[PDB]
Amino acid sequence: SSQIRQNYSTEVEAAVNRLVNLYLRASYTYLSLGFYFDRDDVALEGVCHFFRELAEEKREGAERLLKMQNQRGGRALFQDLQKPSQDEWGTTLDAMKAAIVLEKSLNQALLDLHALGSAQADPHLCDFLESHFLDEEVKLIKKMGDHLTNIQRLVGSQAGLGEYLFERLTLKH
Template sequence: MLLKALRSSSLSGVVFADHTVSVPYPNVSARPAALSYGLCRPIRASADPDVAQSSALTGIVFRPFVEVQEQLVQVPPSSSQSLARQRYSAACEAAINEQINVEYNASYAYHTLFAYFDRDNVALPGLAHFFKSSSDEEREHAEKLMKYQNTRGGRVQLQSIVMPTLTEFDDPEKGDALSAMELALALERLVNEKLLKLHKTASDENDPQLTDFIESEFLSQQVEDIKKVASYVSQLRRVGKGHGVYHFDLQLQGEAA
């Protein structure tokens, strides 16, 4: 009956298992167009075990409602714990809190420099504005770190800010502008060292998200700030005290405008 069905449907060269059934056509032009152009090819069973194995694949690479069960049991049952925290170690959390304190202390130190150069008997508004902007930048860095801490499910713990031990910056040999700018350069280099320490902690804890955050949001900008302040130190060393500082201050005012 199978042969009769094949003859009635005018099929030729069809393979079932390893047996080929051939029915001659009385007229070649009577063959179906698909067979004439080779679009329908005979199917033969392959002895290749890899092909046989691939035919058993389902094509499913991700089963969300099955695989999610492992993560579901890790979701805290109470909102008293962070629901967003995942692969965020206590060491990274503590390091972020430490860096927040570093940024706030740097901001406080810059604010002291701003207050000094804003005095009426010092009267260098360009330097005052530069140090005020530097203070604001460090504070913004601290706030950015606080925001990241909350994003990762950590807890912000603010620490004490140290009172600046210096309030006068006039040096008999260097003058106040150069003395203050050298202090700013040392401060930027110190902050950079602290950031590198934070980055190392993130690397040691296998936290690629934190390392990416530090690299993209802090380290690149930090080296630019170091270069900028280093250039200011070189310029102040060149112009000396007195009249040269006045013109340097005018330059800073122009950059701030």
């Protein structure tokens, strides 16, 4: 009903609101992951910083989707944000596995939205996802896969020592 709305389906408008909820939920999961690694009995600063930076990136993604929703004449609708799936995240290896599962779920939601845009002949939506989300997700998932391989190679050798070395020598602090 908006004065500007053109070629923007109700199906895509609703799917964009659901994707905003998924990105904010992911940002909240990363806030929990980051503060868990800042616990005095965990104390892996580089791991905390890696996840806190991802919490910011996911919030930025949600904000970009909200700006686009308004640019197209859709109406942002917010839903409750489910708490993260765990209260304690285990080792750096467990946390990095949970993060890659979370990113693959966001990536699948982006791919599903792109397919909906293609089905609705909405090229601005496809361009938007391609330009600001799809490549960023593939690059992040590759970086996480690289980190998992390095953590596994390290903790297979000597668990405690390996986790410390990965946080000191790979992660930023």
